[PDB]
Amino acid sequence: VRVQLLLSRRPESVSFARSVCGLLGLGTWPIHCSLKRLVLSSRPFPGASARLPLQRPPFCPFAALETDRGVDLGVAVILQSSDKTVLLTRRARTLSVSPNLWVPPGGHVELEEELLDGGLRELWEESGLHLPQGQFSWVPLGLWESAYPPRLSWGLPKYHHIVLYLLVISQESQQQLQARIQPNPNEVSALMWLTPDVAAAVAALPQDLPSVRARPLVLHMSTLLRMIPTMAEDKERVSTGTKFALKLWLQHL
Numbered sequence: 001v002r003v004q005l006l007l008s009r010r011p012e013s014v015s016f017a018r019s020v021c022g023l024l025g026l027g028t029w030p031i032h033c034s035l036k037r038l039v040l041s042s043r044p045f046p047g048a049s050a051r052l053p054l055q056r057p058p059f060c061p062f063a064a065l066e067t068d069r070g071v072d073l074g075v076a077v078i079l080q081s082s083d084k085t086v087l088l089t090r091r092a093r094t095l096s097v098s099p100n101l102w103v104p105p106g107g108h109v110e111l112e113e114e115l116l117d118g119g120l121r122e123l124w125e126e127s128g129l130h131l132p133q134g135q136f137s138w139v140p141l142g143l144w145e146s147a148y149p150p151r152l153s154w155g156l157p158k159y160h161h162i163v164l165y166l167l168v169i170s171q172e173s174q175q176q177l178q179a180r181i182q183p184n185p186n187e188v189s190a191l192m193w194l195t196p197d198v199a200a201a202v203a204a205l206p207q208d209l210p211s212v213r214a215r216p217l218v219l220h221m222s223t224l225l226r227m228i229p230t231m232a233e234d235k236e237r238v239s240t241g242t243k244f245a246l247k248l249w250l251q252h253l
């Protein structure tokens with residue numbers, strides 16, 4: 001699944017090297033979009049279902065520079081409990097493409113699947129939370145242009161995504177939710193729940209509560225506030241897009 005821009009009134013694919021953010025404008029708002037092709041435009045259009053914030057990290061490789069590939073599309077899910085807490089997942093210790101990142105569960109949008117289905121699935125592929133009909137609302141939060149490797153300091157970029165974060169707001173408690181959680185060891189090595197105050201801190205109490213059966217873990221604010229390096233390194237920290245997402249979640253509240 002790819003990404004197109006309505007700069008005129010007739011859409012076009014984006015060339016990979018180009019900053020989507022730049023073509024539409026560190027951030028731009030509101031951005032009108034439809035996922036059905038993700039379509040983006042600074043201007044409204046007949047198809048569009050949401051007006052969203054689009055941001056890039058200050059270290060974006062494409063904004064710096066201003067081709068057998070294109071601009072992929074990812075989805076990631078911010079799952080809020082009845083208790084106003086959100087789930088994060090540390091990516092599996094078992095390596096390859098961004099290991100030990102705390103990120104919300106997410107990944108490639110499939111091909112022909114709707115957005116909520118990509119989220120709700122990716123949630124399930126990682127946490128094994130299946131959400132029962134009528135026991136959750138959802139709202140799209142925003143759009144985040146990213147790369148692997150993250151920035152010029154780590155290499156020229158291979159991957160180029162637009163990530164759409166969803167907020168899935170459950171009517172169930174964290175107790176009730178954590179109960180029926182059954183993660184996949186191969187995809188995630190740790191799960192945690194964030195309060196607003198901890199999220200507020202991460203986005204902008206010295207320790208928060210398993211690693212993976214289920215060994216308990218004390219994650220230290222130090223870790224959760226760790227910033228991104230210049231020189232590559234796979235150290236346990238919270239990704240820059242997740243920070244954008246969590247900021248957005250707080251705006252929502």
Ligand code: EMC
Nearest residue numbers: 021022025027028
């Ligand atoms: C020039 C605003 Hg991404």
Ligand code: EMC
Nearest residue numbers: 033034035049050
């Ligand atoms: C499907 C919300 Hg751009």
